[PDB]
Amino acid sequence: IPRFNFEKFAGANDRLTTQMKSVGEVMAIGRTQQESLQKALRGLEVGATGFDPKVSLDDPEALTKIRRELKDAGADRIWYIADAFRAGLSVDGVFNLTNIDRWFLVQIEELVRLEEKVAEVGITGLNADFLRQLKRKGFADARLAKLAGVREAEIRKLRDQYDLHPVYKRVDTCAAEFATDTAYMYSTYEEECEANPSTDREKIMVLGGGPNRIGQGIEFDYCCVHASLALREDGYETIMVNCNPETVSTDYDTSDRLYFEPVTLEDVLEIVRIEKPKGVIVQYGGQTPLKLARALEAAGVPVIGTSPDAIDRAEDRERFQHAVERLKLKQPANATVTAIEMAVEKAKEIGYPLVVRP
Amino acid sequence: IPRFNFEKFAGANDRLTTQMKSVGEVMAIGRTQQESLQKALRGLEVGATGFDPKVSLDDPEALTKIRRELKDAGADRIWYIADAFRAGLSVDGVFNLTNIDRWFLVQIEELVRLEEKVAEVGITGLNADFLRQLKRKGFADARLAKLAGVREAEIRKLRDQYDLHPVYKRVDTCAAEFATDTAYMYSTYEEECEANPSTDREKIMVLGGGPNRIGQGIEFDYCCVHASLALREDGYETIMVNCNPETVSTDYDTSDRLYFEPVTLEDVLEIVRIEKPKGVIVQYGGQTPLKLARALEAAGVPVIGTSPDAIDRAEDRERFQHAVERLKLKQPANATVTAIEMAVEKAKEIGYPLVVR
Amino acid sequence: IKSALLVLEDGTQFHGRAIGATGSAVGEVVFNTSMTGYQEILTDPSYSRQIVTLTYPHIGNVGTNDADEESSQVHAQGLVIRDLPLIASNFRNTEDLSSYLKRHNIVAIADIDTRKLTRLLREKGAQNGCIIAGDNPDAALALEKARAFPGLNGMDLAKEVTTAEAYSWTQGSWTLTGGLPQAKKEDELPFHVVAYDFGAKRNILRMLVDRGCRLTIVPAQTSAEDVLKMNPDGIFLSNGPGDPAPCDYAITAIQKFLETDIPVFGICLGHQLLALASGAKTVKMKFGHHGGNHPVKDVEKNVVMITAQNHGFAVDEATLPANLRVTHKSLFDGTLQGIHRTDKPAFSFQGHPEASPGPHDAAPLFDHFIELIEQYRKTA
Amino acid sequence: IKSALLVLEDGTQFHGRAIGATGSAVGEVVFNTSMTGYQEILTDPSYSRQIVTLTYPHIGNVGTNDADEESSQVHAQGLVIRDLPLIASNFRNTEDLSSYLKRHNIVAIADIDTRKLTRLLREKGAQNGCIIAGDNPDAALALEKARAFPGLNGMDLAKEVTTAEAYSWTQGSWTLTGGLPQAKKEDELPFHVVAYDFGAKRNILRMLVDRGCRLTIVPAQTSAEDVLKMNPDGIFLSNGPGDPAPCDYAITAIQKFLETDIPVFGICLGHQLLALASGAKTVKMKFGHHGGNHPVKDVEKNVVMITAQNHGFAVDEATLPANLRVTHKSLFDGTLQGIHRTDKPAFSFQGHPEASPGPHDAAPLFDHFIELIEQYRKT
Numbered sequence A: 001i002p003r004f005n006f007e008k009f010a011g012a013n014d015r016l017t018t019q020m021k022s023v024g025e026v027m028a029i030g031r032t033q034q035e036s037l038q039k040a041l042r043g044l045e046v047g048a049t050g051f052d053p054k055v056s057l058d059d060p061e062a063l064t065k066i067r068r069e070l071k072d073a074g075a076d077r078i079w080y081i082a083d084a085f086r087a088g089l090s091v092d093g094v095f096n097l098t099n100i101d102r103w104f105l106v107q108i109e110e111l112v113r114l115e116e117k118v119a120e121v122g123i124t125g126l127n128a129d130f131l132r133q134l135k136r137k138g139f140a141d142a143r144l145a146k147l148a149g150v151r152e153a154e155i156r157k158l159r160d161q162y163d164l165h166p167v168y169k170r171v172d173t174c175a176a177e178f179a180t181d182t183a184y185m186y187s188t189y190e191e192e193c194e195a196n197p198s199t200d201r202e203k204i205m206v207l208g209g210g211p212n213r214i215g216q217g218i219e220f221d222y223c224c225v226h227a228s229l230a231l232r233e234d235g236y237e238t239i240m241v242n243c244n245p246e247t248v249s250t251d252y253d254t255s256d257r258l259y260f261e262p263v264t265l266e267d268v269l270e271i272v273r274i275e276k277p278k279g280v281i282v283q284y285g286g287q288t289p290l291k292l293a294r295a296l297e298a299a300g301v302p303v304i305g306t307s308p309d310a311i312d313r314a315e316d317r318e319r320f321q322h323a324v325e326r327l328k329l330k331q332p333a334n335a336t337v338t339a340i341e342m343a344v345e346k347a348k349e350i351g352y353p354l355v356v357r358p
Numbered sequence B: 001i002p003r004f005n006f007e008k009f010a011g012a013n014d015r016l017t018t019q020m021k022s023v024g025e026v027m028a029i030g031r032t033q034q035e036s037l038q039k040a041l042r043g044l045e046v047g048a049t050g051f052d053p054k055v056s057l058d059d060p061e062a063l064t065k066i067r068r069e070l071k072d073a074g075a076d077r078i079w080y081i082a083d084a085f086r087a088g089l090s091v092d093g094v095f096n097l098t099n100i101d102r103w104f105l106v107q108i109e110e111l112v113r114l115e116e117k118v119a120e121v122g123i124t125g126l127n128a129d130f131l132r133q134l135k136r137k138g139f140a141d142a143r144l145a146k147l148a149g150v151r152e153a154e155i156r157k158l159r160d161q162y163d164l165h166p167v168y169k170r171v172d173t174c175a176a177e178f179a180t181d182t183a184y185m186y187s188t189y190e191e192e193c194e195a196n197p198s199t200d201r202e203k204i205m206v207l208g209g210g211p212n213r214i215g216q217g218i219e220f221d222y223c224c225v226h227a228s229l230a231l232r233e234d235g236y237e238t239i240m241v242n243c244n245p246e247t248v249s250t251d252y253d254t255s256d257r258l259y260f261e262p263v264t265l266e267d268v269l270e271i272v273r274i275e276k277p278k279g280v281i282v283q284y285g286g287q288t289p290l291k292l293a294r295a296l297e298a299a300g301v302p303v304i305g306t307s308p309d310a311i312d313r314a315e316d317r318e319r320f321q322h323a324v325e326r327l328k329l330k331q332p333a334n335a336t337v338t339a340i341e342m343a344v345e346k347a348k349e350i351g352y353p354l355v356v357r
Numbered sequence C: 001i002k003s004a005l006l007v008l009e010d011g012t013q014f015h016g017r018a019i020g021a022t023g024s025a026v027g028e029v030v031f032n033t034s035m036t037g038y039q040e041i042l043t044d045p046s047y048s049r050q051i052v053t054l055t056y057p058h059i060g061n062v063g064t065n066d067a068d069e070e071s072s073q074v075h076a077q078g079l080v081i082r083d084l085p086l087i088a089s090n091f092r093n094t095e096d097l098s099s100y101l102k103r104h105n106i107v108a109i110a111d112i113d114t115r116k117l118t119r120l121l122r123e124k125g126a127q128n129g130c131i132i133a134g135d136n137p138d139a140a141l142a143l144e145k146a147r148a149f150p151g152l153n154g155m156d157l158a159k160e161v162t163t164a165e166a167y168s169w170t171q172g173s174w175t176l177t178g179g180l181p182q183a184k185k186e187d188e189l190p191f192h193v194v195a196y197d198f199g200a201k202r203n204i205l206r207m208l209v210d211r212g213c214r215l216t217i218v219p220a221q222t223s224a225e226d227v228l229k230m231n232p233d234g235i236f237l238s239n240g241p242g243d244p245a246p247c248d249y250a251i252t253a254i255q256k257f258l259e260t261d262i263p264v265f266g267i268c269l270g271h272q273l274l275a276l277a278s279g280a281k282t283v284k285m286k287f288g289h290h291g292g293n294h295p296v297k298d299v300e301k302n303v304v305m306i307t308a309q310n311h312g313f314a315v316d317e318a319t320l321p322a323n324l325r326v327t328h329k330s331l332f333d334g335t336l337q338g339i340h341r342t343d344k345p346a347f348s349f350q351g352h353p354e355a356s357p358g359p360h361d362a363a364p365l366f367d368h369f370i371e372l373i374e375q376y377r378k379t380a
Numbered sequence D: 001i002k003s004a005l006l007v008l009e010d011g012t013q014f015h016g017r018a019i020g021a022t023g024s025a026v027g028e029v030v031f032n033t034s035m036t037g038y039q040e041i042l043t044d045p046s047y048s049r050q051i052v053t054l055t056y057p058h059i060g061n062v063g064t065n066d067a068d069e070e071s072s073q074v075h076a077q078g079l080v081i082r083d084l085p086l087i088a089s090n091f092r093n094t095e096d097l098s099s100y101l102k103r104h105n106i107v108a109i110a111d112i113d114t115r116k117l118t119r120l121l122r123e124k125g126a127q128n129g130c131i132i133a134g135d136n137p138d139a140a141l142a143l144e145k146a147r148a149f150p151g152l153n154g155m156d157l158a159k160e161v162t163t164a165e166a167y168s169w170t171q172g173s174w175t176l177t178g179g180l181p182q183a184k185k186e187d188e189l190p191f192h193v194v195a196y197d198f199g200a201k202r203n204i205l206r207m208l209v210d211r212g213c214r215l216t217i218v219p220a221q222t223s224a225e226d227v228l229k230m231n232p233d234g235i236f237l238s239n240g241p242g243d244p245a246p247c248d249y250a251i252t253a254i255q256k257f258l259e260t261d262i263p264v265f266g267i268c269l270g271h272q273l274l275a276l277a278s279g280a281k282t283v284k285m286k287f288g289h290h291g292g293n294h295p296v297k298d299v300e301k302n303v304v305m306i307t308a309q310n311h312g313f314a315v316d317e318a319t320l321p322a323n324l325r326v327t328h329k330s331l332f333d334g335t336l337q338g339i340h341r342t343d344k345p346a347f348s349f350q351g352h353p354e355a356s357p358g359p360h361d362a363a364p365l366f367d368h369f370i371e372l373i374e375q376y377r378k379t
């Protein structure tokens, strides 16, 4: 799935055409198209958890917006397709507007109906059989959580109750016709696991940054590759988690074990569960891993290097202010203003020109 | 199908509710739901030939308008259902909006798909096996013709080519378990014809006005009934053509033969075809049959009474002015103005106040 | 293009489309006017060897379900319709009609002028015909098959559908709220009745059980001696296919019961045998009575009831013995519909008091029987 | 729920969903790596008595069409797949996969870990298994059914699938524009090839005709002398199911033709038979070669070809008679794939020159046959 950055180019034409406008791409692997596709959506790093809705059902104008996005594709068409099915359009209707083979469309419609079922039955309705079937179709715990009105952690927990966990299969070029000694893996909800994690080594996991975007480029990936190169050289068993198909970080030669997976908390926890790393590096892959840091350590993960709290101390506007004052250092005058009027006055006080953060 | 007159009541709430707002109704009979439903639409007298589109396939806002029309029903929802299928909505989506049982909905969708095919192939694609199919689903010559890009007559001419004409079945209350001596018939594209027209009597056909609507009420029907009664009394065999289920005109005792059919060029010609009447009265049913006059005559029908041409001379503004003038009679000053500027002028001329049609 | 064909003895062709199993079907073609209950129609054993024509154009609108099965199987040999709907639409549906048809291996044909056919059979009377469903059905062949068919006259079909062994029946009637109830404990149902299975409909049994009757279904050829040994509180004669004449064992067994004071009640074929076993003679109707809008007068009460009918044979009232009174008559043709014994506690109805499908109008007839039975145990 | 169960001799169970006929199927379980060609595979007679497992998860994406039928029927005993897609999506489709399997009464199962199955077959070797598709599939019974299967080793399946009488074949190859061509009139075709039907694929025939060869298809057991009587320009040995070793009538007939100067070319089974005729030995492979990406080297020219393979037995090279020269070899495992008689106009190939499905890379093999034929008549 391609990664776009139209919000940074407010005045640009955002319709897709024969001239490339994307800035990166994510890749996913699944035992079926549905699983493949949902996993890609969840690691695209756009805040999506799968087919999150773009339009409300309650909007009389929704279909008009919908039809438009289908007919003249933008970066959000994938989500609009599901929106379409949710609003009564048919596969032939969507095809007609988009030209996407029905082979793919029907899969998306099937996934929407299943979502509607989750919405209806609620969490109570999520028995083991149903939940497993959903995990198999690639549904994220977070998406399922939004649907049944609960927190992600609850869905995850339920999965634990049911011993419902994915298995890891290996890439081997030959559909398993020949044995492999490489550990290039992807998660799937299947019967047999090929992870076979070692238990004689001290493992260090390195988390990548997903697809590239403006501001989150190859520079982080480089750092990622270096952590693995260095530590493996030192004798550690290096495990990389990433899903950008363009980089060196996703070349099986770069680490001891490569997990070509979405860099999400759910996906990473599952790896952590079976690898039991001595340590996890979240500081080299950019924003993506940086944001999971707190939740990872809060999830029992051995986060190494600068702590997620210290990170937050720095990223936090007011926490940092404090730090700077404590250190008796110099910082531009600031003020957090909720409303306008207050602005103009606080502004009088800070002194123009000013930098307005959204 | 109910008949509405909302255009005459511009400031009214035109949404359907528990309080009736319709002014009349039409009825059709077909061997199948689809045939029956399509005959009704074409008998409605609203200018429909069936499921004529209400919105453009290219209007970006179309789905929005269709959705509103389906959710909060107005007199034209039936037409929007079809449009909703042409625009991509599924049976489930239409049901959720309308609450109309899917048994019906799926039937309308299939009619839409078949319309799509016709549009694709056109005329050249109108084989006989397929034209029959279309006829059997209740398709009007005028509808196909629109779809196919031709004239209704081309479609009809075509149907003759292939000896594709309807058959007539009879109403008997018993599903054929008992024979009938009554001649209460409906057209259908089936195998056996039960019309068995007479050859020994002088027949006269009376054309009804279809559903009642403001301006085309019971007064017309009263005249049709009177036409049938008097002519029958006099010894002519009377044939009534009408589809208003509320009237005495469609009561089987009112005439010798009743054809409960849409009052259209198509349906009337098929009757004439087989009946071969001595005369056809088109002057007692209101606007409906009056308008068919000229084309029925062009088509060889034996129209009696005032000629379609004579009717036009009255019905046509200028022709009639011409007539007044010839008679040296008096009429109010008039003028035909295309544009505004020209009006204001012709107007200064004519003299206010004025009556602008 | 999935062809089907219907050819009758007279060699009348009806070209349509296949909607059921592939292959061939042969039997007596009949028309049924029922606008509702086609599954019940198809699962009625009485339809054995006959190819059913439905006058109502749309057939299959409500799909199918189990509760709507009258027997264990689809007894019709065939099915001819005008239109199979695109979908089934009813909360009770469990399977569409084409599907069900295939499942039961029924050759079926649709899209034919069912009226014209109805009119033919009406005017011309019962014909034998054949449906050939396939890629290139051979007219001449079906016609040949049509003609080859023996015909229902003189054909014992009851022995052809009866049970092989006797079973107990204690299941009541269906409800909207509860669907088909759980069979009862014999400790529950007060009267004990024997029911000759001439090709019985579940509804009769159910309606019987509803009345507080524990049933014992026996095969069609069971001896009286054998039955009498059960100490029945009553004996019931069921509905069934084919000619009732040819069923010697029945008349016998029946005559044998008549000799006795035990209450006998027959329905449809059961009614015919009761007549036969009483001295009466049976006849084969030109077209028969197939529908659920059939008016039948109760001569005694001068009352009219709308009834469900399924017969191709009737009893001659000219052939009635003075010991057999006439209790019901058809207002459509004057044909006989009920008879009672002047001497005995025996009565029988030509129509279907259990309906299914159809008007519940004739239901009180079971009320007579129970009366009889209560009386029998008072005196007995 | 439409339940299905797959049970292997070893007791391994795979719980799925029924996608074909209701019932039981028993046979030798094999895996095939072809990402396309599932219908062609199913209809290949060589799969007689085997339960076919496809490694590509989505099987049925393009539905089915009569032109993609490699024989008159579906020869596989059963089909094991991971996912049966919701719809078929291809202009050539005339019928969805599940419908088709039912039509053909093929017990089939979907939704199982075919990767796990593949790894087990690869690691432990071929196994017999049973598919039970039904309401409440009995795992003990499927295991018993699986274990009762006698196995392909020692089983002549060729005699089982051969044609009862001999027919003439003059139809060529399909084309996207044309489709399947009408059959030709004998006159249009210069050569008469007598082809032994050991369970022959439609494609080989076609490819021969394309090369101007009129064909006379003869039953598997036909005698050499009965064939000779046809004054064959060339003789062809078809592909086919089961053990070749037990087909004495074949070996026999063959060795006879091998006393003559009549050009002979076999494929697959035909290839194994030609070698047995020459005195070589056959072996039953651990899991065999079933796929459309198998690299085969032409040792003579030192070139690689990507081939379509379908065989579970092979000719042992170390038992080669000096009259048989090794022309081809497998680049995956070193197994023998081609041989040529040093003294006669007799050559054969292990893989499938007619492909269908798969890479057209080995097609040039037929040219060498035709060249020998021409020679023959030249003289």
Ligand SMILES: NC(=O)CC[C@H](N)C(=O)O
Binding pocket: A170, A178, A179, A180, A181, A194, A195, A196, D119
């Ligand atoms: N998954 C692994 O640990 C690989 C094991 C072994 N080499 C195989 O290919 O089966």
Ligand SMILES: NC(=O)CC[C@H](N)C(=O)O
Binding pocket: B170, B178, B179, B180, B181, B194, B195, B196
């Ligand atoms: N159509 C008619 O002329 C009626 C003929 C006849 N009375 C019948 O009902 O069959």
Ligand SMILES: [Cl-]
Binding pocket: A125, A127, A130
């Ligand atoms: Cl569930």
Ligand SMILES: [Cl-]
Binding pocket: B125, B127, B130
């Ligand atoms: Cl056509």
Ligand SMILES: [Cl-]
Binding pocket: B191, C013, C014, C015, C111, C112, C113, C114
């Ligand atoms: Cl017909």
Ligand SMILES: [Cl-]
Binding pocket: A191, D013, D014, D015, D111, D112, D113, D114
């Ligand atoms: Cl499994």
Ligand SMILES: [K+]
Binding pocket: A192, A193, A194, A195, A196
């Ligand atoms: K493992």
Ligand SMILES: [K+]
Binding pocket: C015, C016, C111, C112, C113
């Ligand atoms: K027809």
Ligand SMILES: [K+]
Binding pocket: D015, D016, D111, D112, D113
């Ligand atoms: K499974």
